[PDB]
Design a protein around this ligand. Structure first.
Ligand SMILES: NCCc1ccco1
Ligand SMILES: NCCc1ccco1
Ligand code: NA
Ligand code: NA
Lengths: 161, 161
């Protein structure tokens, strides 16, 4: 079932989400099923549960190929201080994109919806997607991370390298 | 003649505009005529010449009532340090609004399109409009002035006081 994606300005995108505590349940499997589907209909590469107004530490992402993943109770650590600039957009901020600094190298940990543990090192775009989705879980969106406001603009108009 | 308003992301909104040097001419009167009209069709309270891709120090504004004004070669000074927060939107960033700190009290100076000098003290919303329009002339848009990113969002969704 495709869910409505809420837009920036909605207070529910600004909350810090509680943990998932129904790993392995039929209710979580259906929520995650809904998320992949909603993400797919909107042409996303990541979708966080708060974006469909569900206050949970849960994100789906994937499709340089990133594996399709449902991740609960995500925890992220940088693996060094190297930052890298890259284009980001967000389904809750449609039409826009900016350049954002993210960590080149991360490890992320949590659980697959079935309860099995997930822990991975990620770099580049894989790592950027996870950091962007993780921000949602703590009530943060990308504009508050823009450093060069010349790069922020509408997708069909932008001519910055 | 209604002109197209260019959208954030277009590099022409990022330029520092040269001075108007055709005060009193028929060409300037027609450009200003176009601006009031374009501003009116789009339901604006301010429109700066770079927003219709004209690289000039020129803005129209007006309609708490603000007088309808065409101002060339604007120069602004704060009349104290008091800042005040207030809602801003922009025709080149359609659908969005944020809260922005501006000076409560200003003086602005320049010329009416006919060449006669203009100098005014302004406060509150009058002053905010002029500071926002003036930013355009130096290649600055409002997102780079947001301090509370919780206030930035779509107009039909926002519930912040
Ligand atoms: N759409 C959210 C995922 C994403 C894409 C590019 C950076 O983050
Ligand atoms: N639309 C540009 C003028 C303006 C309106 C509110 C603050 O600035
Ligand atoms: Na918050
Ligand atoms: Na600039």
């Amino acid at each position: 079932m495709i869910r409505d994606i809420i837009r920036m300005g909605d207070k529910r995108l600004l909350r810090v989400a509680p943990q998932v505590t129904n790993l392995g349940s039929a209710e979580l499997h259906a929520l995650v099923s809904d998320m992949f589907e909603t993400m797919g209909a909107a042409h996303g590469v990541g979708l966080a549960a708060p974006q469909i107004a569900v206050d949970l530490q849960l994100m789906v992402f994937g499709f340089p190929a990133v594996p399709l993943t449902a991740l609960a109770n995500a925890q992220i650590e940088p693996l060094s201080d190297e930052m890298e600039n890259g284009w980001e957009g967000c389904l809750s901020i449609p039409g826009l994109r900016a350049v954002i600094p993210r960590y080149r190298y991360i490890r992320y940990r949590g659980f697959a919806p079935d309860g099995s543990p997930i822990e991975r090192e990620a770099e580049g775009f894989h790592a950027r997607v996870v950091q962007h989705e993780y921000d949602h879980l703590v009530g943060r969106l990308y504009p508050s991370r823009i450093e060069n406001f010349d790069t922020f603009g509408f997708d069909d108009v932008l001519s910055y390298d």
